[PDB]
Nucleic acid binder design. Structure first.
Ligand SMILES: Nc1ccn([C@H]2C[C@H](O)[C@@H](COP(=O)(O)OP(=O)(O)OP(=O)(O)O)O2)c(=O)n1
Ligand SMILES: [Mg+2]
Ligand SMILES: [Mg+2]
Lengths: 547, 395
DNA sequence: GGGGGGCGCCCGAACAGGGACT
DNA sequence: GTCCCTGTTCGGGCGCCC
């Protein structure tokens, strides 16, 4: 039946007109399926036959549905969608089983042919013209392929449920498109009466609830999970097994693991992820690295084991524990009671050409917090593998505002640490190096080198370089030729800004080599001075490297 | 009442900013506040065919049982079609929230769609709930404008009765300065609030600038002087009078950083000279209302923050310092800083600055609304600063 | 095989800004 | 001005849901 709700007025973008597009050829099996669907909808007033006074047309097809014994009529409105106005989407995210609270009684419902129950605007109907060939129609309801349909459906569904929600503030309805999880603290009999009430309410608004899709007992199937009364699990994940891997297969493997990491601890995908760094097409085959190959097995092993999440008790705290996986990779578990995960996850983004483990840990915390706020609407308490003192050093030294909310150390290595520490004051009895670089923009040739207070001077000629590079090269060379304690003076803001931030990893081979040196040293002191002001002996070395 | 037509800037479209995730507390507040506003006809439910959006959240004053709704209208304001010098001198200034005043004026029907916003749900239990305004919205720059006429009418008597009192408004805010005792000031404020009721604290004379200053010591190492010359070299951009020639000369040769250098007679002088140049104020800085106030803030450490306001580089309208108790929350401090600097600038020039914030975008967005207490929101951008400039304003 | 919207993840293009240099 | 480096944003592919 069709909802008696008011339509939502839509319009084309200005200067635009409806889609004229030839109906590509269909398989027999599908044409049979479509007239079966169309002859039914047309009787039901859901589609109307049009005449020649309708110029437009748009292709149509059908894919089998998930049960796979019924078909879904689709329309390739890709073109009409370009010319339809903008909507503000009202679906803000995806409900997560870990955010559900324990309920005494639970139900899950689907709506039967959801979109086709919601009326489409009269003035906009002509643009939906399509053709079933062996007979040509337009839509009176929302079609499945138009970009207006999701927001209009979701919004309408929300209007329809408002009265019921107002009347029943204490029944909880998670509404995802037409999927409804309905939970109560009522005994099963009284709950079931409330469900009938809900169903009649949807019926008066034209939304049927087929018993076939009405779950009454657990485990409930919902959003790709199975919900048991005291625990939830994801529906079984199956990774591919090819002996030859393409980009597409990789991306399909990455996705499936990411999806898995929400409840399977330890998942990693850096090795896999880099593979597709250069690759320029889905088609492209790629050879696994011994690194990647190795990851997959680790993951592949992780999945073999049985895992579950639990529901949320709001009268208890939320805790998040983070572990370091090396490589800029992090894992976390969110719980309230130990060894009873709410959910899990990973962080692995690499923000910045250069960084260290304290920054990355700060980025992990930010991410988990935002995510905890979406799901439970509050921040968790943290347990992190970082000493309170380590954090304080970093917080003190660092010139940016930085902060972790309430937290507690957990000595589960590998612990996060700063790997070296610049001296705040010049080092007594440490050779002073005055470093500098210059490069020619045209020829691309350069020189890095130093001069020391002890009479030493060295100059190295470089090729295919940049000023910034020569400046970094000069510092590297001074670290190389100095004892375990060195004072270094540079006139390079660039270099000083990088090193002073205490990175332990870099995209740059050069900075990695520098980082290597810095860790070996007992004491380093970096002074800055402004260039070309004849300051000695930045002056003498500037002369040496410019020729 | 009849409505004032209102335009967008030509060639400009309405805001389309995504709502960020809210806490349960803020969402419960908002849903509460919103249903009442809907009863009173102040806001209406809208569909997704309205393509505009502006973020919304909520703040809880001090220790109170009352939340204030707060719409981030910065974008809308930018796109919306387009001062008492005495106020910065009062011994006390109180800030009143007269935003309620706005809900009594209706709003141009053809404008309402640009004021759309969305309430989120916990755990995406439901799609967003979208509203638009039917009256003048707090926080919108169009609001003080439309209502200015009726605002003068309310106040004219109170002003006549109290000619020594200066009343200023910035959007939802009424700034009120007096030269009275506290209690006399406060009793006077309660007077205006009661006068305001029938229609339906700052101390700008303890605001201080933080001058640049130079280390004073009895022995100087090469390092001490190298730092000094670099700091002066940069300062000489702000004061053309500074000179680092004599002092440089001591850094002739190529010497150990920890070597001590006796200051020559000239260098001792140049240094004394410079100390004085820093005392003589910045020549030639004219506030321009057609340009934006830029604010830079540097974290100095141990609760100390420094800031400068300028419209053009090295041409500071003001330079300041911000102190705090030395469980310190850097992010909390920075947003307390930003609020206080914005407050000053509203008072001194009746305009908000663009902040260049020394923090990571995500850190800041993760947390700043936990510490906001103002009815306005300054534009801002994020910067990873040269650790050079931190030492320049160092106290 | 050919559609839609949401969130997530990675990646690479196109910017935007600041420093250093001609 | 240019060239270099680094940051952000936005649009691809995939995953998951309906
Ligand atoms: N691949 C998909 C799956 C769903 N939908 C939309 C249109 C559907 O109407 C709605 C809900 O999906 P269902 O699988 O519940 O399908 P229907 O409600 O259309 O049919 P059924 O009666 O089989 O549930 O979401 C879509 O556009 N594309
Ligand atoms: Mg359905
Ligand atoms: Mg140089």
């Amino acid at each position: 039946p069709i909802s008696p709700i008011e339509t939502v007025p839509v319009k084309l973008k200005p200067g635009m007109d409806g889609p004229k597009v030839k109906q590509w050829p269909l398989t027999e099996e599908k044409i049979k399926a479509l007239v079966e669907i169309c002859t039914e909808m047309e009787k039901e007033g859901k589609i109307s036959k049009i005449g020649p006074e309708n110029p437009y047309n748009t292709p149509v097809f059908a894919i089998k549905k998930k049960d796979s014994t019924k078909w879904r009529k689709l329309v390739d409105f890709r073109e009409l969608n370009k010319r339809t106005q903008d909507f503000w989407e009202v679906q803000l995210g995806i409900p997560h089983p870990a955010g559900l609270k324990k309920k005494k009684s639970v139900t899950v419902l689907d709506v039967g042919d959801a979109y086709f129950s919601v009326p489409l605007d009269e003035d906009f109907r002509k643009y939906t013209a399509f053709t079933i060939p062996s007979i040509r129609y337009q839509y009176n309801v929302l079609p499945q392929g138009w970009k207006g349909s999701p927001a209009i459906f979701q919004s309408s569904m929300t209007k329809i449920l408002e009265p019921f929600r107002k009347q029943n503030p204490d029944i909880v309805i998670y509404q995802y498109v037409d999927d409804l999880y309905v939970g109560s603290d009522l005994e099963i009999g009284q709950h079931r009466t409330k469900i009938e009430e809900l169903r009649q309410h949807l019926l008066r608004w034209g939304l049927t609830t087929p018993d076939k899709k009405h779950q009454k007992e657990p485990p409930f199937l919902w959003m790709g999970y199975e919900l048991h009364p005291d625990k939830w699990t994801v529906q079984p994940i199956v990774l591919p097994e090819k002996d030859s891997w393409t980009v597409n297969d990789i991306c399909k493997l990455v996705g499936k693991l990411n999806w898995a990491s929400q409840i399977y601890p330890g998942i990693k995908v850096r090795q896999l992820s880099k593979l597709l760094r250069g690759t320029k097409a889905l088609t492209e085959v790629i050879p696994l690295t011994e690194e990647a190959e190795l990851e997959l097995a680790e993951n592949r092993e992780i999945l073999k084991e049985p895992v579950h999440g639990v529901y949320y008790d709001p009268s208890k705290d939320l805790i998040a524990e983070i572990q370091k996986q090396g490589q800029g990779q992090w894992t976390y578990q969110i719980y309230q009671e130990p060894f009873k995960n709410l959910k899990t996850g990973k962080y692995a983004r690499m923000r910045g050409a250069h960084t260290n483990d304290v920054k990355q840990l700060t980025e992990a915390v930010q991410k988990i917090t935002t995510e905890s706020i979406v799901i439970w609407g509050k921040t968790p308490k943290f347990k992190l593998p970082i000493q309170k003192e380590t954090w304080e050093t970093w917080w003190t030294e660092y010139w940016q505002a930085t902060w972790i909310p309430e937290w507690e150390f957990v000595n589960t290595p590998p612990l996060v640490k700063l790997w070296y520490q610049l001296e705040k004051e010049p080092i007594v009895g440490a050779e002073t190096f005055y470093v500098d670089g210059a490069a020619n923009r045209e020829t691309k040739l350069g020189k890095a080198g130093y001069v020391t207070n002890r009479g030493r001077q060295k100059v190295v000629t470089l090729t295919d370089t940049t000023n910034q590079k020569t400046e970094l090269q000069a510092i590297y060379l001074a670290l190389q030729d100095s004892g375990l304690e060195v004072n270094i003076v540079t006139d390079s803001q660039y270099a000083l800004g990088i090193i002073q931030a205490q990175p332990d990893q870099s995209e740059s081979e050069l900075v990695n080599q520098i980082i290597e040196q810095l860790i070996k040293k007992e004491k380093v002191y970096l002074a800055w001075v402004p260039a070309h002001k004849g300051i000695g002996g930045n002056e003498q070395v500037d002369k040496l490297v410019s020729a | 009442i009849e409505t004032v037509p209102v335009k967008l800037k030509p060639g400009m479209d309405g805001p389309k900013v995504k709502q960020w995730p809210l806490t349960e507390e803020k969402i419960k507040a908002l849903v509460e506040i919103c249903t009442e506003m809907e009863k009173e006809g102040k806001i209406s439910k809208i569909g997704p065919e309205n393509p505009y959006n502006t973020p919304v959240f909520a703040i809880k004053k001090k220790d109170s049982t009352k939340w204030r709704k707060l719409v981030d209208f910065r974008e809308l304001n930018k796109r919306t079609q387009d001062h008492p010098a005495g106020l910065k001198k009062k011994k006390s200034v109180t800030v009143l929230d007269v935003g309620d005043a706005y809900f009594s004026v209706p709003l141009d029907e053809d404008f309402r769609k640009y004021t759309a916003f969305t309430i989120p749900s916990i755990n995406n239990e439901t799609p967003g709930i979208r509203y638009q305004y039917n009256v003048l919205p707090q926080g919108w720059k169009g609001s003080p404008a439309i209502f200015q006429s009726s605002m003068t009418k309310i106040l004219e008597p109170f002003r006549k009765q109290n000619p020594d009192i200066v009343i200023y408004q910035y959007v939802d805010d009424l700034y009120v300065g007096s030269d009275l005792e506290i209690g006399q000031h406060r009793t006077k404020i309660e007077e205006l609030r009661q006068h305001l009721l029938r229609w339906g604290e700052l101390h700008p004379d303890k605001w201080t600038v933080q001058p640049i200053v130079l280390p004073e010591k009895d022995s100087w190492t090469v390092n001490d002087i190298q730092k000094l010359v670099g700091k002066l070299n940069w300062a000489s951009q702000i004061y053309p009078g500074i000179k680092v020639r004599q002092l440089s000369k001591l850094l002739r040769g190529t010497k150990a950083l920890t070597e001590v250098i006796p200051l020559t007679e000239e260098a001792e002088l140049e240094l004394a000279e410079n100390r004085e140049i820093l005392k003589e104020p910045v020549h030639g800085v004219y506030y321009d209302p057609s340009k934006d106030l830029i604010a830079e803030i540097q974290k100095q450490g141990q609760g100390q923050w420094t800031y400068q306001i300028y419209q053009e580089p090295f041409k500071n309208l003001k330079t300041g310092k911000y102190a705090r108790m030395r469980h310190t929350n850097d992010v909390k401090q920075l947003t307390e800083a930003v609020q206080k600097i914005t407050t000053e600038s509203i008072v001194i020039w009746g305009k908000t600055p663009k902040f260049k914030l020394p923090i990571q975008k995500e850190t800041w967005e993760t947390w700043w609304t936990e510490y906001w207490q103002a009815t306005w929101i300054p534009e801002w951008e994020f910067v990873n600063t040269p650790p050079l400039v931190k030492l320049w304003y160092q106290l």
